Design a protein around this ligand. Structure first.
Ligand SMILES: CCCCCCCCCCCCCCCCCC(=O)OC[C@H](COP(=O)(O)O)OC(=O)CCCCCCCCCCCCCCCCC
Ligand SMILES: CCCCCCCCCCCCCCCCCC(=O)OC[C@H](COP(=O)(O)O)OC(=O)CCCCCCCCCCCCCCCCC
Ligand SMILES: CCCCCCCCCCCC[N+](C)(C)[O-]
Ligand SMILES: CCCCCCCCCCCC[N+](C)(C)[O-]
Ligand SMILES: CCCCCCCCCCCC[N+](C)(C)[O-]
Ligand SMILES: CCCCCCCCCCCC[N+](C)(C)[O-]
Ligand SMILES: CCCCCCCCCCCC[N+](C)(C)[O-]
Ligand SMILES: CCCCCCCCCCCC[N+](C)(C)[O-]
Ligand SMILES: CCCCCCCCCCCC[N+](C)(C)[O-]
Lengths: 223, 84, 169, 223, 223, 71, 86, 86
């Protein structure tokens, strides 16, 4: 209810919701990390993707809720009615700053700036140069620039984590082969012995608790 | 397509080099221990396996810094050739 | 389903013993891995089951399930036998496959013992050439009983409904 | 007629049902253990994934169906009366305690408490946690806090179990290899010999039956 | 709207948009390149297709937007009203040229001409030409001729890029397999070890940044 | 309805048997060469296609399916 | 019924016949080369592969025709058994 | 069907000659390095592999241009046959 166009906007947003969650939210990172852990342990079907994605979605909800609540309360407020296009548009813009400021901590400055340079109207000569002050440039780059830079930087940071997770298992896999060769049993496949060792190591390390905690700690602050 | 031809030839060259050294170290260790078995002769199968493992591990531990730089240079070069 | 899963297991055991680990067959509907032998024997059992008129027994056991236990009486499957079910299915397949496994083992150890006189002979690579021929040859002799050995002895029948289910209301 | 919101709640619930089952029910454990044992025996696709998932599903219902039926029997109760949104909320929450108790039984207190903090503490200007005495909060962790803490504990239990099942098969592999060497019948791959032995031994001892009983007896008495 | 037929045409175009985007835009290229990257890294499930496609669509938006805007600003002028069929037809035709240019820049003329001569029934569809004579064919060619040529011309380009992107990883695979043979560990599958090396290699190159930048730079130019 | 399903399945069974032969043969010759890492499906797909085309399957099949319903 | 049993049996019979000759020659070549390498002591292991590739390809050339005649006749037979009922 | 006969036979002949050259080189090197170990009565696993790798890489550096000529020729030819009727 209210302005007919505000209603249209609400319904459009709620229609695009899953693509936003899939492309501009920490869900991107958690989804990748859990699957990489499964591959590092060497399991092809355990757990199901339907279990891993469920966990990842729940964990993401905690991180994202406070922003959605703050933006909702900000718009469910009768304070004002607006005289003009410039007043309304700047009131709208000031509501998204919480999200804009979430994206800014994690996207990378140089890629963000390159995308902002990309949007400007073309010129016949190369574009007229500019430098702009921080309250736009640092504080307020446009969201249609921030969003893909975020997605890309997140993917990268995810691969990085997966790399570290692989290292100890690689160590195991080598050592076990070298010991079997020292015993001369050259023909036996070492996978049959290395796999359970890997599982033992992961449960004694309690890898799930550590991963689930530290991933949240990267975004929340808890005391 | 000079660029494509070059990229291809370079690939094989890189494989031949980057695999070369470890096989040479393993060869020399295996040969030297082998000859050392002919004097004071005792004949045992596993000594080559025990010692060559140390050879190759130590070789990779020293040179692994080099490998990454060569690979990086190649990757950049091909990415540029492709996107130009 | 019980008669078909046994023949499918049989086919998987044979295709594993003869090598053939990278089998080609395709099946997306059930979401189960499949091999050429498994697919063949799984089809063949189905056509002989239909040709013996089993399709009548399927609707018979459906109707009996409603007469013997009713939706409104909270009919429920019995637990104790369900705990046996998987092991009975495995057992029947091994009992049925056993004749081909033993001959394929003896054929390999015979080449192993032969290799003692000619240690450069690659007995493994020879056995890979032989075993698929031996496997088909032997399966071709004991083939005809595969008709009756499934059409009756493994088919479920309506009298069994008494034990697998009860009414809890 | 009925109430138009309780109708929405019914239809919504029935769409989410398979994801709840897949992520907050013992199905999580049963479906894992079987597939692990199947890999350890070294012959994939026997039994079929259809057989395994089917059995796991059936067994999960004995544990969970009484709890749902108890909840519906709690709600179909013509003697209640209410006065306010609070008095209704309390009674609806009270209806879910039967499920809440099951999740509390099978999950870690400290991981639950961590997520219970993480839902809020991004709000908080303070470090003190005593500010509510435990007796309420220890009983009332939220269900969204319980769910992922339960799933992450079920997986770990599954791995613990499967670890101990791998050991005997490993032993059998070592024995076979040592015999082939002691006979000097060197150039034969041991897997071809030992996979038949593992299969026949486990089936001849009804491993699947003992396994099924040992799994259910954590959750029910069969008698 | 001032004309019912203008309204009909506008709605029809709005209904066909997704097939035009999927068949006449750089999206064709960007969509393919990312999936080839994932394959060359040897990953099955991750990232999700809708994550990759989301990024591809965002990037293509920057490239195509200038044309859409030009055409909108051109068409919204009611500055002239039309005496006749030919005057209207020419006014419309001259509006598409901003798009027609972009297609003709990247397709390959020998196809375009081949199709032109084909949709006309001319001279029984194909005949020899003694003389070769070029007739400002750039302005003659129909969009219905240009579209397929563009599609094929750009698919091919994508395959080329994917070829170049595979080589570095192939090197890694063959190197790992050779040093394992040097150690004599003949039984062990390289994929357990080669994968993390690929991950760290791509992370150190920062392939997403270079790749994304270069793709845009093929169409635009930026300081 | 169940009678037609029965007979259609029955007809469909017969048609597999040549392609089943093709597949098992190809797999045996590859193992005879030791190329255990080759996926047979790549080789066996075109042999199936050319077999069916040489039979002219759709002619025979559409003829017989109609003749079953009229004398 | 008996038509079903007959056709299924024949399928296995044809597999056996067609595959038999290549596997025979790959066996004989494997034995001869393995013996030769004991008669003169040489520890090569690709030589069997190199020879048996030529051996198998040659007999695929020889039997290329009979392979197609057998499979055509079988396909026609089973299509008749399936459709010609009255 | 002289066209299907031709394309099918040529595919196999091309497999045989494209693959033969690397395997011939590898086998001859294998034999000579196996001999040298006998006349020296000195033994190790790795020397033959090490030399074989170099031998095959040189074989590919040399011949690979001709591999491209042969494959392009066959690629065109089969397309023209497929679309020959019109
Ligand atoms: C990614 C999101 C892009 C979604 C495309 C929206 C397409 C708008 C349609 C259009 O161009 O006509 C507008 C059309 C233009 O009319 P004009 O003022 O006469 O130029 O109507 C409007 O005035 C703007 C109404 C747009 C409401 C959409 C809000 C979407 C919110 C996204 C979630 C936050
Ligand atoms: C979230 C907000 C809660 C809303 C609850 C209100 C429901 C109501 O009062 O009207 C009843 C109304 C149904 O109408 P009725 O059937 O006529 O009573 O809404 C429902 O659909 C009931 C849903 C609540 C029951 C929760 C049971 C959860 C059991 C957990 C078992 C999980 C595994 C499943 C096993 C297979
Ligand atoms: C061990 C590498 C195996 C590669 C097999 C394909 C070889 C022929 C095609 C690549 C030729 C590369 N070359 C010589 C042009 O640089
Ligand atoms: C063959 C075993 C050793 C392979 C080492 C290859 C490393 C490639 C990754 C280089 C990364 C360089 N970096 C980022 C660590 O400086
Ligand atoms: C199989 C799921 C559908 C039917 C619901 C079964 C509910 C569990 C009943 C278990 C009764 C066990 N018993 C008799 C020992 O109490
Ligand atoms: C590695 C080769 C596997 C070939 C399996 C198929 C054998 C039949 C080939 C077709 C008939 C013979 N020929 C010469 C025309 O190809
Ligand atoms: C893999 C089975 C053996 C290869 C032959 C497969 C049948 C190909 C089609 C045969 C056609 C015979 N022809 C040319 C006379 O029609
Ligand atoms: C390179 C291995 C696969 C080659 C397959 C060739 C299929 C040829 C099919 C026709 C065979 C029968 N023939 C020659 C009479 O037509
Ligand atoms: C490291 C092995 C790489 C094998 C593939 C190399 C790329 C294909 C060969 C491209 C060049 C072909 N040639 C020599 C005809 O130009």
């Amino acid at each position: 209810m209210g302005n007919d166009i505000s209603l249209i906007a609400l319904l459009a947003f709620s229609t695009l919701l899953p693509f936003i969650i899939a492309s501009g939210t920490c869900f991107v990172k958690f989804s990748i990390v859990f699957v990489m852990v499964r591959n590092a342990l060497g399991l092809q079907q355990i757990p199901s993707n339907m279990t891993l994605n469920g966990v990842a979605l729940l964990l993401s909800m905690f991180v994202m809720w406070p922003i959605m609540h703050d933006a909702y309360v900000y718009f469910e407020d009768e304070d004002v009615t607006f005289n003009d296009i410039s007043s309304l548009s700047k009131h709208v813009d000031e509501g998204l700053d919480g999200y804009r400021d979430y994206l800014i901590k994690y996207s990378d400055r140089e890629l963000v700036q390159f995308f902002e340079n990309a949007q400007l109207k073309r010129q016949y000569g190369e574009e007229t140069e500019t430098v702009k002050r921080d309250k736009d440039e640092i504080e307020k780059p446009s969201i249609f620039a921030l969003l893909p830079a975020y997605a890309l930087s997140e993917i990268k940071s995810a691969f990085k984590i997966g790399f570290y997770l692989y290292l100890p298992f690689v160590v195991v896999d080598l050592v076990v082969s070298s010991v079997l060769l020292a015993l001369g049993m050259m023909m036996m496949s070492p996978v049959t012995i290395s796999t359970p060792i890997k599982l033992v190591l992961f449960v004694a390390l309690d890898g799930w608790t550590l991963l689930s905690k530290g991933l949240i700690l990267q975004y929340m602050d808890i005391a | 397509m000079d660029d494509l031809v070059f990229a291809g030839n370079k690939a094989l060259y890189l494989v031949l080099i980057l695999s070369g050294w470890p096989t040479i170290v393993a060869t020399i260790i295996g040969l030297l221990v082998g000859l050392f078995q002919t004097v004071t002769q005792l004949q045992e199968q596993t000594l080559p396996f025990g010692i060559k493992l140390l050879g190759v591990c130590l070789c990779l531990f020293l040179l692994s810094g080099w490998y990454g730089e060569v690979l990086l240079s190649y990757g950049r070069q091909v990415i540029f050739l492709a996107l130009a | 389903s019980w008669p078909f899963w046994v023949m499918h297991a049989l086919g998987c055991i044979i295709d594993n013993q003869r090598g053939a680990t990278l089998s080609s067959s395709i099946d997306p509907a059930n979401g189960i891995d499949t091999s050429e032998m498994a697919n063949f024997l799984n089809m063949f059992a189905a056509v002989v089951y239909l040709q013996n008129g089993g399709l009548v027994t399927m609707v018979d056991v459906l109707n009996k399930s409603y007469q013997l236990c009713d939706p409104m009486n909270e009919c429920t499957p019995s637990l104790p036998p369900l705990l046996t079910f998987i092991n009975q299915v495995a057992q029947n397949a091994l009992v049925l496959a056993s004749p081909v496994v033993l001959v394929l083992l003896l054929s390999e150890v015979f080449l192993g013992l032969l290799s003692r006189f000619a240690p450069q002979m690659n007995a493994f690579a020879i056995s890979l050439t032989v075993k698929s021929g031996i496997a088909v040859l032997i399966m071709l002799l004991y083939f005809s009983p595969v008709l009756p050995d499934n059409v009756l002895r493994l088919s479920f029948q309506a009298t069994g409904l008494s034990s697998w289910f009860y009414e809890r209301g």
